[PDB]
Point group: D2
Chain length 380, copies 4
């Protein structure tokens, strides 16, 4: 029925055999066959299928309202598998500010295999239509994006993709299936870095993919089996376990996000704040139309590198580390940690200023997170 119930009872996460109320961890590579070709429960080799992996695959399919789930050894392994649906000479349209690892994979790996990519500003969906070439096969969209949280209209992207025969893909990592369901809006394939919110505890690197399309699912299964970027059973188990509390975690994070944004907007040492909940944010109305909650990632401007570093030193409850979606609140400086490759003038042009801070809101008490960040900002 409701979302918090579906998180607990959706998917197959018990043992039919013993009745165990959690998925057994099948730390195994192969399976007895009673006769040649007769598989007791359909398992024959863990790369092809593993019962613990099958459990987390059924969870993500259920939560995204798809039919088929796939678990990969990382988010970028999921992305790489989806890109390998295409051939040399095929073309992909992506949003201009995709995740750095996605940008790296596409422009430094798959470009050597002859896949062509263009990065366009998808906040206006007619820019997608202009970029469509005769060779375009795929539209790949993150929303909201990192680190400036640009929003793309998912449903219009799906219609454009359908009209032009494109496979549509949404990287739904930042919103999670608790708040945004791209398959319900016509998207062909949805994927996640489960390393972030889904696992939720900073202790699994994993990617998840769901689709309702039988033929796309069969092609993904073939690629997964052939290139072998499969999630292991122990990580599959920890993913299933972490997903149980996804709703509670996301709701705590959202309460804190609202209060933190009020504080940031009021504070004199903060300039621009980037988050889709802000009413003046581009495509705010579009985000509310396609999601019923918010990501915990917020970016905001302080004055310069020195203020950003002192902010980090002065906070007691914001932890300096890579990644997002932890139970701890995380803090980082994109210009130094994710975009330090880009020359400074182009960084500034894109809005990645020296004093741009990104926080990933965790599940600490709301008042503590607000008060801690405010008192640290007061030291500026």
């Amino acid at each position: 029925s409701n979302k918090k119930t579906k998180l607990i009872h959706g998917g197959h996460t018990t043992d039919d055999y013993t009745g165990a109320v959690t998925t057994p961890i099948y730390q195994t590579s192969t399976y007895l066959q009673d006769d040649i070709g007769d598989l007791r429960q359909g398992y024959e080799y863990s790369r092809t299928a593993n019962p613990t992996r099958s459990s987390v695959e059924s969870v993500i399919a259920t939560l995204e309202n798809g039919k088929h789930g796939f678990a990969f050894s990382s988010g970028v392994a999921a992305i790489s598998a989806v890109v390998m649906l295409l051939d040399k000479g095929d073309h992909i349209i992506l949003n201009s500010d995709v995740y750095g690892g996605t940008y790296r994979a596409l422009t430094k790996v798959f470009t050597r295999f002859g896949i062509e990519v263009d990065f366009v500003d998808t906040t206006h969906t007619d820019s997608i239509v202009q970029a469509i070439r005769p060779t375009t096969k795929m539209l790949f969209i993150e929303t909201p994006s990192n680190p400036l949280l640009r929003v793309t209209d998912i449903k219009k992207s799906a219609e454009i993709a359908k009209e032009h025969g494109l496979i549509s893909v949404v990287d739904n990592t930042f919103m999670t299936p608790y708040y945004q369901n791209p398959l319900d809006l016509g998207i062909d394939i949805v994927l996640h870095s489960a390393t972030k919110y889904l696992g939720g505890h900073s202790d699994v690197v994993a990617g998840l993919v769901a689709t309702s399309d039988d033929k796309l699912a069969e092609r993904l299964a073939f690629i997964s089996n052939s290139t072998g970027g499969i999630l292991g059973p122990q990580d599959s188990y920890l993913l299933v376990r972490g997903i149980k509390t996804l709703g509670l975690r996301m709701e705590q994070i959202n309460r804190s996000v609202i209060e933190i944004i009020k504080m940031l907007q009021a504070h004199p040492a903060v300039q621009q704040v980037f988050h889709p909940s802000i009413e003046s944010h581009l495509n705010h109305d579009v985000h509310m139309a396609q999601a019923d909650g918010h990501t915990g990632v917020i970016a905001f401007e302080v004055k310069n590198t020195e203020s950003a570093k002192q902010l980090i030193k002065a906070t007691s409850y914001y932890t300096l580390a890579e990644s997002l979606g932890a139970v701890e609140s995380l803090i980082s400086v994109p210009a130094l940690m994710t975009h330090a490759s880009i020359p400074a003038d182009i960084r500034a042009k894109e809005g990645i200023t020296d004093g741009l801070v990104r926080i990933s809101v965790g599940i600490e008490d709301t008042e503590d997170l607000v008060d801690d960040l405010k008192q640290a900002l007061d030291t500026l």
Copy 2:
């Protein structure tokens, strides 16, 4: 010093911090930074590097006498990473009877990305020289191969590759580093399905890669980080644990292999036996020159499908399952399980007869394995 000592004390498999005599399992995705960019021990994000994965990587590099190790989510993920060293338009020479998963990946995935492949009979190394095209970049060799155990001269392959500027790769799964060290013979890259002998216990799917080449290592690290087919920490730990007993297991397997082959050659219901220890086997002398032991995989002919199936039913200690390198002895019928896709007439032409049986010798008592298989053959 000697091999069994190096298995125990080679690589870094203790905890410098606590002194723990086994590698801690870092079930973690990210790492505190004391200041922006300052990593306490060089770790920042588990996809890029994880201390448990680093441990198994240092073991495989040590055991193969290389400098750099890489752990992937499966054997075929390791193979896929190595193939991705090449670009569209590049050409690969492989032995004609490569592992089915390798054949599938190359001819159904990477061919769509414009990598060109030819499968040639490398048992004569001048067939490699004939196949070399202006676009050839890589020579990929398994030895001995599956399921007929064809042997390829590793050292001459390495010289040919050096002379023509080719990256040379050996799939060393069947022999393990305990018996065959391709990097010592001039090969650029050695790889393994650690799913088999290295893990040794049928409970991890994993691939391992080693090289001494700094620049190839840097390219593999970039591909691993970008396409994300990384082995998880729990599987990395179980791999390190299984490798400790590799020498004892391989030596038990070899004692049984010798006795089983004597029995098979003497038995009237057995026709041809395929194994590199047989003196009339093609390139027997070459195998002894490049290895100091034997794989546990043996193939042999019985009369037909019915005899093969009754053999399986009559054995008490041979287990019908996919994979090899278990502690249990495994039995299978290639024509029904690995080559059933190939039309029957071409199967017979290649020597994959209906009555071709493959066994993977385990670590059960030698006399039991010999006696069990003999009494089952007597029922034919």
Copy 3:
């Protein structure tokens, strides 16, 4: 600062060495010594101390505002260790309705070792004073109790224990440290079946003990080391992980508990409801004075065995299984599952009627849990 923050940042649950943001899993039994007797970080043998176990021990000590934590292989192993603080001839006072496993251990194991026990109704604390013998050494109190949720005044129990030289112990399983802190009220020792709420995911059997008393801690450490009921590192890790979401889970459970109790009190097929939040419940005022929330365990009466069984069959979201504190809502019938040993007439006398149902409220959506249980009650 506030409770939800302390759950995330309290205790030592990172790796000082690598910076890993989660506790490494030390699957290890022993530790290198640089010289005889010099331990790098104080570890020498995992039974005596293990760094992953040390992490969960520091969490429970922090959450209960104690100084010393201890992790055992189960709740009853923790209880057994605490009982072994006493000698033959010593006497224990416990509440009359202690957990069945505690009753079993005391009256069928430790009674054979000459420990004497009396079970008294501690809802009136003067009954403790009357039961105190010259040989009494320990007062052991659960509050609230199972399955009728009787409440005992913790602070008065602590004063009585101090006045008469008794070691005071509270089994704080049902309330968790999120809502009730016995050490802050003068109790000597607090313990938990971490199998329930603390782990929270039905996937660890474990006991935890905390104290502020240096000398009691030293005696518990000696008993733990000597009788060896230690929690393993993998379970220790999963406990630390589950505790992160304890606050969010308990708060969801409490919202559902309030609404479910309203429904139960209004429903015509329900007679008596047992829960400390009900204002007419014995020692309701005492519970509010010593706790700032509620357990998720509720008991209530339907008509008979048949109604209880049909209730179970008609619910979609209440799961029939043993244990409590899961993310799933659990349902059971004490007279058939925990008290079937007791003759029926004595069952009825104690209030364990045939139609007494116990539910453990999980973290499903509140409206679903209320509506599901109501519609099932309507079928009666």
Copy 4:
């Protein structure tokens, strides 16, 4: 049939449900019941029984030729459970040099519960007969003992126990079931610290118990369920995995033991050597009558503390750490590490001289272990 085959195929270590060739890890606390009291496969609560624990229990029962197995959180938890078969006023006879942890448990824990113990020299079995009191209920024997490897006649001990109505117990840790089977010689109960050889990889703390006696098994099951010192599922799994290679490891260790003892006896810086394989060792003939191999623990005398410490510093392949039965060879000095509590004069009287060295032989190459220890002895 033969021992190495029984190690692989004995016990139930596959999944009947999926066919998985390894035991699934049931990281779970509780189990769905289809109706009240109807258990799908007999499981209801993991403390009472867990399917992964059940697997390792069936292995130890099979390997010791018993009927019932029990897995505890440590060796001393197994010992404590067996001691709790007795009541206050009952008396136990143990060998005079039992393991220090066993001595500690008995004389500092269970003595407070009124169990009486006498430690006698069981190398002459008539000393057992003399020590038998009217209150004696149990005979507890280690053979061979630590650190001087005294041998006790198991079969005569069993007959004495039967004649006088005693429960007989053998701590079979040092020999393992691969070489010595006390239940076959009439002993009632056999137990192990699986922390040592059985796990074999220094990464599990665990105890195992086997018996053929239905009534003793029922009493052990009740004590295990009631005091809760149960082994967890992950450790149970690693135990099952480690036991697979027990035969190969023990045989490698035995080859090295023979050669090392030759070297030690010939070396001028070595005085007495203690090991049951030495023909002049007390009860050498008795050991050969009840075992078909040897423990890897050897003790030998050098001159003094300084020589012992320099020996440790000069070895490359002997590791200074607590415990035994690792894949690594371990070295220690009892007078400083296990018997430093005992005054020096009594240490010397018992034979625990300052220069007494204990080694636990691992699975490194035999020639390396011999040569390394010899060259280090030459520096004396």
